[PDB]
Design an enzyme around this catalytic site. Structure first.
Site, PDB file in Angstrom:
ATOM      1  N   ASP A 140       0.823  -1.212   0.000  1.00  0.00           N
ATOM      2  CA  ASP A 140       0.000   0.000   0.000  1.00  0.00           C
ATOM      3  C   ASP A 140       0.855   1.260   0.000  1.00  0.00           C
ATOM      4  O   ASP A 140       0.612   2.198   0.766  1.00  0.00           O
ATOM      5  CB  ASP A 140      -0.994   0.014   1.172  1.00  0.00           C
ATOM      6  CG  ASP A 140      -0.318   0.229   2.508  1.00  0.00           C
ATOM      7  OD1 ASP A 140       0.832  -0.229   2.669  1.00  0.00           O
ATOM      8  OD2 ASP A 140      -0.935   0.861   3.392  1.00  0.00           O
ATOM      9  N   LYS A 142       2.049   4.736  -0.518  1.00  0.00           N
ATOM     10  CA  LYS A 142       1.174   5.906  -0.466  1.00  0.00           C
ATOM     11  C   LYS A 142       1.978   7.166  -0.216  1.00  0.00           C
ATOM     12  O   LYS A 142       3.163   7.099   0.077  1.00  0.00           O
ATOM     13  CB  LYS A 142       0.104   5.718   0.608  1.00  0.00           C
ATOM     14  CG  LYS A 142       0.655   5.448   1.992  1.00  0.00           C
ATOM     15  CD  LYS A 142      -0.471   5.016   2.920  1.00  0.00           C
ATOM     16  CE  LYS A 142       0.066   4.470   4.218  1.00  0.00           C
ATOM     17  NZ  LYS A 142       0.876   3.253   3.953  1.00  0.00           N
ATOM     18  N   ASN A 145       4.543   7.684   2.455  1.00  0.00           N
ATOM     19  CA  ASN A 145       5.844   7.021   2.316  1.00  0.00           C
ATOM     20  C   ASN A 145       6.878   7.872   1.584  1.00  0.00           C
ATOM     21  O   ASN A 145       8.021   7.444   1.373  1.00  0.00           O
ATOM     22  CB  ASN A 145       5.717   5.701   1.551  1.00  0.00           C
ATOM     23  CG  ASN A 145       4.929   4.656   2.299  1.00  0.00           C
ATOM     24  OD1 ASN A 145       3.928   4.139   1.796  1.00  0.00           O
ATOM     25  ND2 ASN A 145       5.395   4.311   3.501  1.00  0.00           N
TER      26      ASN A 145
HETATM   27  C1  LIG Z   1       8.261   8.235  12.213  1.00  0.00           C
HETATM   28  C2  LIG Z   1       8.159   9.698  11.941  1.00  0.00           C
HETATM   29  O1  LIG Z   1       9.266  10.358  12.446  1.00  0.00           O
HETATM   30  C3  LIG Z   1       9.263  11.717  12.198  1.00  0.00           C
HETATM   31  O2  LIG Z   1       9.306  12.050  10.848  1.00  0.00           O
HETATM   32  C4  LIG Z   1      10.312  11.434  10.108  1.00  0.00           C
HETATM   33  C5  LIG Z   1      10.024  10.717   8.980  1.00  0.00           C
HETATM   34  C6  LIG Z   1       8.681  10.531   8.371  1.00  0.00           C
HETATM   35  C7  LIG Z   1       7.662  11.593   8.563  1.00  0.00           C
HETATM   36  C8  LIG Z   1       6.447  11.463   7.954  1.00  0.00           C
HETATM   37  C9  LIG Z   1       6.181  10.290   7.073  1.00  0.00           C
HETATM   38  O3  LIG Z   1       4.963  10.168   6.450  1.00  0.00           O
HETATM   39  C10 LIG Z   1       7.144   9.335   6.854  1.00  0.00           C
HETATM   40  C11 LIG Z   1       8.466   9.485   7.527  1.00  0.00           C
HETATM   41  O4  LIG Z   1      11.021  10.137   8.225  1.00  0.00           O
HETATM   42  C12 LIG Z   1      12.349  10.224   8.547  1.00  0.00           C
HETATM   43  C13 LIG Z   1      13.312   9.545   7.659  1.00  0.00           C
HETATM   44  C14 LIG Z   1      14.641   9.619   7.954  1.00  0.00           C
HETATM   45  O5  LIG Z   1      15.491   8.970   7.112  1.00  0.00           O
HETATM   46  C15 LIG Z   1      15.117  10.361   9.166  1.00  0.00           C
HETATM   47  C16 LIG Z   1      14.199  10.976   9.978  1.00  0.00           C
HETATM   48  O6  LIG Z   1      14.590  11.669  11.080  1.00  0.00           O
HETATM   49  C17 LIG Z   1      12.750  10.906   9.649  1.00  0.00           C
HETATM   50  C18 LIG Z   1      11.734  11.562  10.503  1.00  0.00           C
HETATM   51  O7  LIG Z   1      12.108  12.247  11.617  1.00  0.00           O
HETATM   52  C19 LIG Z   1       8.027  12.364  12.764  1.00  0.00           C
HETATM   53  O8  LIG Z   1       8.062  12.337  14.138  1.00  0.00           O
HETATM   54  C20 LIG Z   1       6.794  11.667  12.282  1.00  0.00           C
HETATM   55  O9  LIG Z   1       5.674  12.162  12.930  1.00  0.00           O
HETATM   56  C21 LIG Z   1       6.905  10.218  12.569  1.00  0.00           C
HETATM   57  O10 LIG Z   1       5.820   9.548  12.046  1.00  0.00           O
END
Ligand SMILES: C[C@@H]1O[C@@H](Oc2c(-c3ccc(O)cc3)oc3cc(O)cc(O)c3c2=O)[C@H](O)[C@H](O)[C@H]1O
Length: 290
Positions: A140, A142, A145
């Site tokens: 899925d 989306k 991602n």
């Molecule tokens: C798991 C996510 O971590 C944080 O956002 C990040 C995200 C992410 C945000 C929104 C999405 O729909 C998908 C991912 O991705 C990251 C990727 C990296 O390689 C390093 C990071 O610090 C984050 C990163 O800090 C935020 O706290 C998001 O709310 C949380 O869902």
């Protein structure tokens, strides 16, 4: 609450908080509080990573589908390297993504043209195919991602991300709107399911709407299985062609399902202007700069 799906690599070395040295604390806008850490031991000893600590999140761990290769970085993917739970906390060890943001945050702000979409979809196609080669099947895929780096290039997450809530839990809870017919059927599927999702992403980028959408999950599922898609006539012949070929219900007939896989898509007229080597080298500028 956030459910994170970690697709673990073959010879994965499990981790814990003690294997990481704290370097810095950062506020990263849409990413919230991010810790910069350094791996202490293992194959990746000394590597810098971002770490997120999630208070109330669930972790799902899945095997990838099957030479002894050490992984290297792909220009359009961010990876989840480790995910482990402690006293009520989920730790995610991720590629550090300086000044990263959300694709959604950009899609809400702009009106994409076909020219814009060609760039983002081309980078996404390279990323998705690479994940396929690693044995990852999205199911899925989306917009949640899809991230953007500080330069405005695509970074597809190699991990699943969803929202889950008397209610029984499921090993796989996916956003129905992006699922192929064979995935909705639970009859079996392959990576060709993800090319359908790719088409849904493309349709949504171009139109701001989803191609198959009901009042409830039940209805949306029926539409994915049987609905006649009304193709927006404002779309170019090339865009329409690509969408029709991605939205074949029988995965055997779907563009990208043949032996050459992503090459079937790369060769499509919609992408005729793309230099895939220049693209991979990050030598093509994004239409939107954040
Ligand atoms: C798991 C996510 O971590 C944080 O956002 C990040 C995200 C992410 C945000 C929104 C999405 O729909 C998908 C991912 O991705 C990251 C990727 C990296 O390689 C390093 C990071 O610090 C984050 C990163 O800090 C935020 O706290 C998001 O709310 C949380 O869902």
């Amino acid at each position: 609450e956030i459910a994170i799906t970690h697709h673990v690599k073959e010879g994965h070395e499990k981790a814990d908080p003690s294997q990481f040295e704290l370097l810095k604390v950062l506020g990263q806008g849409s990413f919230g509080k991010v810790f910069l850490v350094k791996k202490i031991s293992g194959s990746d000893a000394r590597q810098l990573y971002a770490m997120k600590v999630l208070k109330k999140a669930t972790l799902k761990v899945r095997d990838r589908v099957r030479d002894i290769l050490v992984e290297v970085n792909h220009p359009f993917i961010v990876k989840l390297h480790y995910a482990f739970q402690t006293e009520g906390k989920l730790y995610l060890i991720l590629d550090f993504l300086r000044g990263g943001d959300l694709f959604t945050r950009l899609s809400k702000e702009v009106m994409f043209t076909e020219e814009d979409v060609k760039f983002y979809l081309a980078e996404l196609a390279l990323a998705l195919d690479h994940l396929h080669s690693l044995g990852i099947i999205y199911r899925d895929l989306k917009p949640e991602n899809i991230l953007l780096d500080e330069e405005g290039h695509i970074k597809l997450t190699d991990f699943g991300l969803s929202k889950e809530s008397e209610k029984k839990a499921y090993s796989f809870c996916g956003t129905v709107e992006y699922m192929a017919p064979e995935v909705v059927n639970r009859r079996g599927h392959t990576q060709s399911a993800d090319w359908w999702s790719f088409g849904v992403l493309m349709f949504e980028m171009l139109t701001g709407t989803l191609p198959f959408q009901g009042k409830d999950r039940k209805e949306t599922m029926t539409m994915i299985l049987k609905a006649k898609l009304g193709m927006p006539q404002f779309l170019s012949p090339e865009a329409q062609s690509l969408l029709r070929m991605l939205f074949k219900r029988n995965p055997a007939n779907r563009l990208g399902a043949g032996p050459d896989g992503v090459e079937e898509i790369k060769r499509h007229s919609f992408f005729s202007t793309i230099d895939w080597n220049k693209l991979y080298r990050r030598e093509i500028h994004p239409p939107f700069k954040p």
